[PDB]
């Protein structure tokens, strides 16, 4: 039983991506202090405990599922598509999410507001003509006051429907005050849609849409995400735990039940001695 760890994560042979102050979703959306993580790839994404959010207060229903599937895809390669939003103002932002010196927003999301004094029923489409899945990340804005709702969106109550040939997903945004986070009582709800190859995506919304700017190229492979404060190191090891890299010469380990790579199996016993000699009968 391997019961000790070196305390550091070996950066080979696995493509490690240390997320400094960035969560997976924060790096995905494009938080300013996560701008360095655009188009990154990894074999194992290491997520530090010190990661924080510094943008519009959002919320991800089924956050674990999205984190799991993004980690499994193993890439943050984002292809911007040309969406044509007619009759609305694009690239909305706020001073709670300060990109550069001025107000800003997530770099992968487009906040569409009313143009002039109207908000038409946006109805856009994108076909998936490629032979890989596309991941579209969109959102719904929940304002704090009805005055804000009508000031941003001429409709008194918008709705957002995102659909494919096989499934649909509709959200009725609500207006209400919420706990104060970074100066705001309004929220974003983050949803995702997977467009399989040869399928089409249709977005029909009459208000409160935080539209996508493109798609994330989905992949299949040996990628995952880990929560660990172990420091990265320049070294060789096939088995990674939150406690660092460990040698995989022994068949069992008692360090952690969370493992990655060609790792030993986790057992509750800290020691199991296997005799490699004969019965020992000494003199006297």
């Amino acid at each position: 039983v391997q019961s000790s760890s070196t305390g550091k994560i070996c950066n080979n042979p696995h493509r490690i991506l240390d997320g400094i102050d960035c969560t997976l979703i924060d790096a995905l959306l494009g938080d300013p202090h996560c701008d360095v993580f655009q188009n990154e790839t990894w074999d194992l994404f290491v997520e530090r405990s010190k990661a924080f959010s510094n943008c519009y207060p959002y919320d991800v229903p089924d956050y674990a599922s999205l984190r799991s599937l993004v980690a499994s895809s193993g890439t943050l390669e984002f292809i911007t598509e040309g969406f044509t939003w007619t009759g609305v103002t694009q690239n909305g932002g706020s001073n709670a999410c300060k990109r550069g010196p001025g107000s800003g927003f997530f770099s992968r999301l487009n906040w569409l507001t009313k143009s002039g004094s109207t908000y038409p029923v946006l109805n856009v489409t994108m076909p998936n003509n490629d032979n890989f899945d596309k991941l579209y990340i969109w959102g719904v804005h929940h304002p704090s006051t009805n005055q804000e709702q009508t000031s941003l969106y001429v409709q008194a109550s918008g709705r957002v429907t995102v659909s494919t040939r096989r499934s649909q997903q509709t959200i009725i945004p609500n207006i209400g005050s919420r706990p104060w986070v970074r100066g705001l009582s309004s929220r974003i709800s983050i949803y995702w849609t997977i467009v399989k190859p040869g399928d089409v995506l249709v977005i029909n919304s009459n208000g409160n849409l935080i539209a996508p700017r493109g798609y994330f190229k989905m992949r299949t492979g040996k990628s995952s995400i880990m929560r660990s404060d172990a420091p990265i190191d320049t070294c060789i090891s096939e088995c990674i735990t939150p406690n660092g890299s460990i040698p995989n010469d022994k068949p069992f380990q008692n360090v952690n039940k969370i493992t990655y790579g060609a790792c030993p199996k986790y057992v509750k016993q800290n020691t199991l001695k296997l005799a490699t000699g004969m019965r020992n009968v000494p003199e006297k």
Partner: antibody
Amino acid sequence: QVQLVQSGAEVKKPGASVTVSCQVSGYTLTSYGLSWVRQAPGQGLEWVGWINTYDGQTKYVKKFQGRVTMTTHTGTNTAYMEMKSLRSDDTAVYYCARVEGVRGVMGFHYYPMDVWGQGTMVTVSS
Amino acid sequence: SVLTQPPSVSGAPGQRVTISCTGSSAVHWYQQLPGTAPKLLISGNSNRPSGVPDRFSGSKSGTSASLAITGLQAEDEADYYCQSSVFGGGTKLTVLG
């Protein structure tokens, strides 16, 4: 802005017990571990101990074992260090410093104390 | 396990200072200004954190780490400690006219 705000100076008598507090600001207490470091006046820095917030596991020096207790009030983003069986020699300035690792590793092995408090002059003597 | 260190360095503003620490077993250099909390000057034996001027530097040989201060001026005059858990003995850096 990341800030550690410590208690006021304490004047005690030998054999008592004292409780110093450290209020964090600009970040979440359970994201970072917290070391406590004493400095007698003009006698150089001295590592006292380390609390792993978010799981409550401690680490004190053998010199301080049994008579020092560290706790965290996560509701108020506060950490407390109490020194029991105060002696005259325990008069020193105590600092709470922020250390990085809390999950998978004990942070003080691999990470520095990047943010310090103003320190409290705990004087148990006269 | 033990850290050693030159005890006191007296110098004018504007020149180089080399301090050495000898770690028996990550070494970090801290500065304590007089009547102020200590500050982290370098981590990882060679990395300066945010806000530390690039004049500060660190070099690591097999067992001896060395902190070099360049363009010395007023605020550099302080006490300097090496850390690896155990602390160094301290190194007073006085100004000299």
